[PDB]
Each structure stands twice: as structure tokens, then as C-alpha cells.
Amino acid sequence: HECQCQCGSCKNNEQCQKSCSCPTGCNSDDKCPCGN
Ligand SMILES: [Cu+]
Ligand SMILES: [Cu+]
Ligand SMILES: [Cu+]
Ligand SMILES: [Cu+]
Ligand SMILES: [Cu+]
Ligand SMILES: [Cu+]
Ligand SMILES: [Cu+]
Ligand SMILES: [Cu+]
């Protein structure tokens, strides 16, 4: 999905901007699954 994360790993990360698997509201790296 379109990426609307505010975590450090994803915010302005071009790799997952249009291919993000995170839960909505994924705002913390500690619980971020992106690219798992
Ligand atoms: Cu995302
Ligand atoms: Cu991401
Ligand atoms: Cu993330
Ligand atoms: Cu992302
Ligand atoms: Cu993601
Ligand atoms: Cu994310
Ligand atoms: Cu996130
Ligand atoms: Cu995430």
C-alpha cells in the first residue's frame, strides 16, 4: 500500500513508498515490520 508511516525506517524512504506492508499508523521503528 501507499506508505504513510512516520517511523524513521520508512519516512521519505523511496524503496517502500508504493509497496509498503506496514500496519497503518506505523510510527516507530521498534515495531516496524517493513521488509521483514
Ligand atoms: Cu510505510
Ligand atoms: Cu517502509
Ligand atoms: Cu517503518
Ligand atoms: Cu514506506
Ligand atoms: Cu512499510
Ligand atoms: Cu512502514
Ligand atoms: Cu513504520
Ligand atoms: Cu513499518
Curated annotation (Swiss-Prot):
Binding residues annotated for Cu cation 6, in chain numbering: C10, C16, C34
Residues that bind Cu cation 7: C20, C22, C34
Disulfide bonds: none
Keywords: Copper, Isopeptide bond, Metal-binding, Metal-thiolate cluster, Ubl conjugation
Gene Ontology MF term list: antioxidant activity; cadmium ion binding; copper ion binding; superoxide dismutase activity
Binding of Cu cation 1, residues: C3, C5, C20
Residue sites binding Cu cation 3 per the record: C5, C10, C22
Binding site for Cu cation 4: C7, C10, C32
One GO CC term, this protein: mitochondrial intermembrane space
Chain positions recorded as Cu cation 5 binding sites: C7, C26
GO biological process: detoxification of cadmium ion; detoxification of copper ion; removal of superoxide radicals; response to copper ion
Binding residues for Cu cation 2: C3, C16
Binding site for Cu cation 8: C22, C26, C32
Cross-link (Glycyl lysine isopeptide (Lys-Gly) (interchain with G-Cter in ubiquitin)): K18
Miscellaneous comment text of the record: There are 2 copies for copper thionein in yeast. The 2 identical copies CUP1-1 and CUP1-2 are arranged in tandem.
Free-text domain note: Contains 1 metal-binding domain: 6 to 8 copper ions are chelated within a single copper-thiolate cluster and are coordinated via cysteinyl thiolate bridges to 10 cysteine ligands. 6 copper ions are trigonally coordinated, whereas the other 2 are only digonally coordinated.
Family statement drawn from the similarity comment of this UniProt entry: Belongs to the metallothionein superfamily. Type 12 family.
Name under which the protein is recorded: Copper metallothionein 1-1
Species name: Saccharomyces cerevisiae (strain ATCC 204508 / S288c)
